């Protein structure tokens, strides 16, 4: 038995009279059981406001076995879980799943050393604290397919949010082999049965081509396509899906869809028909009674790139048939002479503009748009680092002292921050542990 630990706890007061406590946290509790690999993932967080009001909940988000196969070549993932798929987009399910064998930037700002949540339906997948300043974030792992759900949690009330797409890279295969996941399940926490499943065959000289379909009863849908890596340049496919979809009326649609990997580079666009279905949107209609967004035109990129100066953009946009279109961008640019960062951002609409700049010896100036606000500041680093700063918010003094450090098996940070005329205190732990 080990467990893989996650918490933050926050306290916030205010000179109008108010406090706020916070305390979240997640992880997975494991076993090796012989050959099989047992998991089971907790999360949970609960707030108390004072004006009188609280929130709370908790859960075990999934919990399931998997095991792989040496002489077989897929591993075998049966119990609890959300279907990834390189065609499909993903939903939640119980299930046994047999696939073969064989990693997202989030991007943003921070008006304060906010505390940043990312997730995918409502599954839980990084929540912790970040330093004021521009953010990225890596804890995230290789699985996730798709689009994710970010928030960020000011230290001052102002909860920012908005919403990123991972770059599916393309489903392509090396000339001799083939890939494929075969699913079946009954959707979760709402099921109805089903069965899913793709493959993707190296007809590749530097072309394959795959498809698959979603079997569930009311719901079908059937999807194909094929792909050409070019080598340096990048890689590129397109596959057709269509849904079907009865309701004892029956809605139809299909969608289109561009892949232009590289490796980084990759952009993607994505259209769907008047009452095109994903198989999640077909559940949050026929057991929630939603068929609100609507999906039609998708577009995103994601650009990191490096040249003495770093150029990281992550775009993208939905438009959609029935809400009104979407949009976030964030780009910022690095300068590496000292070093110089200046960054956009827009998560009602948002806009956040902010440029720090930095002298080694490491101190620091910055500035940043909303309410404007610039600081200086300075940071030791030892091993594990800590950071000061004074400066002015608006007219109100602002004050900051951030620690991290980054052991290989347990982390944990602590800010402090007061404005003139609010003051919080935080916390972020998470590391590895065990029990038995």
Do not use: C
């Not at 792992?141 to 798709?146: A, E, I, M, T, Y």
Request: net charge positive; aromatic share 14%; hydrophobic share 30%.
């Amino acid at each position: 038995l080990m467990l893989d630990y996650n918490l933050n706890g926050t306290v916030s007061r205010n000179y109008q009279g108010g406090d706020s406590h916070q305390f979240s946290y997640n992880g997975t509790v494991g076993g090796n059981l012989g050959p099989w690999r047992l998991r089971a993932d907790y999360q949970g967080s609960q707030e108390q406001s004072r004006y009188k009001t609280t929130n709370r909940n908790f859960t075990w988000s999934r919990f399931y076995l998997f095991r792989a196969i040496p002489r077989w070549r897929a591993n075998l993932t049966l119990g609890e879980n959300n279907i990834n798929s390189d065609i499909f987009r993903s939903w939640s399910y119980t299930g046994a799943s047999l696939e073969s064998d064989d990693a997202p930037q989030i991007t943003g700002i921070a008006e304060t050393n906010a505390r940043v949540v990312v997730s995918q339906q409502g599954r839980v997948l990084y929540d912790s604290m970040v330093p004021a300043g521009p953010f990225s974030i890596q804890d995230l792992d290789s699985s996730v397919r798709g689009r994710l759900d970010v928030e960020v949690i000011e230290q001052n009330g102002r909860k920012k949010t908005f919403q990123v797409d991972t770059a599916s890279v393309p489903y392509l295969t090396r000339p001799g082999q083939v890939r494929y996941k075969l699913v079946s399940g009954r959707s979760r926490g709402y099921g109805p049965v089903f069965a899913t499943g793709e493959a993707s065959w190296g007809l590749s000289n530097q072309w394959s081509l795959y498809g698959g379909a979603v079997l569930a009863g009311d719901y079908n849908a059937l999807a194909a396509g094929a792909g050409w890596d070019l080598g340096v340049p990048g890689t590129l496919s397109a596959d057709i899906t269509q849904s079907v979809a009865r309701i004892e009326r029956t809605f139809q649609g299909k969608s289109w869809r561009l892949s232009y990997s590289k490796r980084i580079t990759f952009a993607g666009y994505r259209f769907s028909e008047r009452n095109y279905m994903t198989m999640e949107q077909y559940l949050n209609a026929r057991y929630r009674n939603d068929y609100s967004s609507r999906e039609k035109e998708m577009y995103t990129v994601t650009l990191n790139k490096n040249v003495n100066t770093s150029f990281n953009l992550q775009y993208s946009r939905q438009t959609y048939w029935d809400i009104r279109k979407t949009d976030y961008y964030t780009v910022s640019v690095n300068r590496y002479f000292v070093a110089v960062g200046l960054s956009a951002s827009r998560s009602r609409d948002n806009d956040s503009a902010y440029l720090r700049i930095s002298v080694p010896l490491t101190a620091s100036y910055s500035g940043s748009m909303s309410r404007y606000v610039n600081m200086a500041g300075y940071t030791d680093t030892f091993n594990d680092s800590y950071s000061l700063n004074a400066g002015l918010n608006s007219s109100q003094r602002q004050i900051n002292a951030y620690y991290s450090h980054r052991s290989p098996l347990a982390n944990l940070s602590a800010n402090i921050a007061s404005l003139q005329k609010y003051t919080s205190f935080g916390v972020s732990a998470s590391g590895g542990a065990t029990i038995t």
